[PDB]
Amino acid sequence: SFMQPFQSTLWLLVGLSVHVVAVMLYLLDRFSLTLSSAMWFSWRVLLNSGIGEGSFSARILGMVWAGFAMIIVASYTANLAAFLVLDRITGINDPRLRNPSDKFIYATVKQSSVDIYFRRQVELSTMYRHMEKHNYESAAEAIQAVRDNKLHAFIWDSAVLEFEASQKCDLVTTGELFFRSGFGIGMRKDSPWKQNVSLSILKSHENGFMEDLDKTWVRYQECDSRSTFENMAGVFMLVAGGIVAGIFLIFIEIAYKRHKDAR
């Protein structure tokens, strides 16, 4: 996800507290081990590589510091659970559409039945200065407007939008079916073949030819649901650079201290 979100001053306080642990564990040795021991005991207990053993009151204080270390681990893992598990346009009932703004402009294609359903109702009065002043010539222009992030949402027929949402990762069909009508056939009033065609429509509903077009054209495609990380990759980079710098200082410090010991 990120780098460390935990207020880097607090990480500095953690480092200074580790040095306070080192100071306390070396200055209290003399009350009955003052060179390199209690450094590695601080990096043993405060890294929790070893919680166990290795006068009395100094070690009482040290296990109080181990209690601090366990509480800090508990609090940071609680924050890792919190800030990863813890905390849109829903339809016409939004104040984004009841009070349509210019940061939220929306459109259709002119000379459409969708604009007829806009122009019939009364409460869409504030909407007509967006839905009639910004419109398109094709719905693919609105698709590109989503893809170019031009306009935030669009209002179209359900099936094509659900298909295209099942195609690519730019689209989610939100809201209910607005203006629930049927999809009919353009037939003149003196056309005598409203009859047997509608009988075939009854056959299509009853014998599942509607479901046959559901199989043969509708129901094919889906998308994923977001189910080896950026935090992980940051850990790889930081730990790799730290190991390289640490190893290339190991040679220098051990060489100088071996030639100190050769004296």
Partner 1 sequence: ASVWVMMFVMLLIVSAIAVFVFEYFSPSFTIGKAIWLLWGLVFTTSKIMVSVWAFFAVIFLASYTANLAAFMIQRFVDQVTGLSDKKFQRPHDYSPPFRFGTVPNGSTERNIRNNYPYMHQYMTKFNQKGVEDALVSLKTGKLDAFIYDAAVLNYKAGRDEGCKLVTIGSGYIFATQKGSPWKRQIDLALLQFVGDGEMEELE
Partner 2 sequence: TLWLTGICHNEKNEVMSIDNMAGVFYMLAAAMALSLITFIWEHLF
Write out the residues near partner 2 by the rule CB under 8 A: 5-7, 10, 28, 31, 57, 60-61, 64, 68, 79, 83, 87, 95
Q: Which does 7 bind (CB under 5 to 8 A by kind): partner 1, partner 2, none?
A: partner 2
Flag whether 29 is marked binding.
no
- Segment 95-154, which members bind partner 1 (CB under 8 A)? 117, 120-121
Q: What are phi and psi of 123, to 5 degrees?
A: -75, 0
Fill in the amino acid letter for 185.
I
* Comparison of 82 and 140: residue with beta carbon closer to partner 1: 82
Flag whether 158 is marked binding.
no
Minimum CB separation from partner 2 for residue 7, in Å? 6
d(CA 100, CA 106): 9
- Single out the residue of 205, 221, 230, 237 in contact with partner 1 (rule: CB under 8 A): 205
Fill in the amino acid letter for 23.
V
Q: What is the DSSP string of 54-79?
A: --HHHHHHHHHHHHHHHHHHHHHHHH
Is the CB of residue 211 less than 8 Å from the CB of residue 156?
Answer: no
3-state SS class at 136: strand
Q: Residue 45's closest CA among 74, 21, 79?
A: 21
Binding footprint of partner 1 on the chain (CB under 8 A): 39-40, 43-44, 47-53, 59, 63, 66-67, 69-70, 73-78, 80-82, 84-86, 117, 120-121, 179-181, 205-208, 210-211, 214, 227-229, 231-232, 235-236, 239-240, 243, 246-247, 250, 254, 258
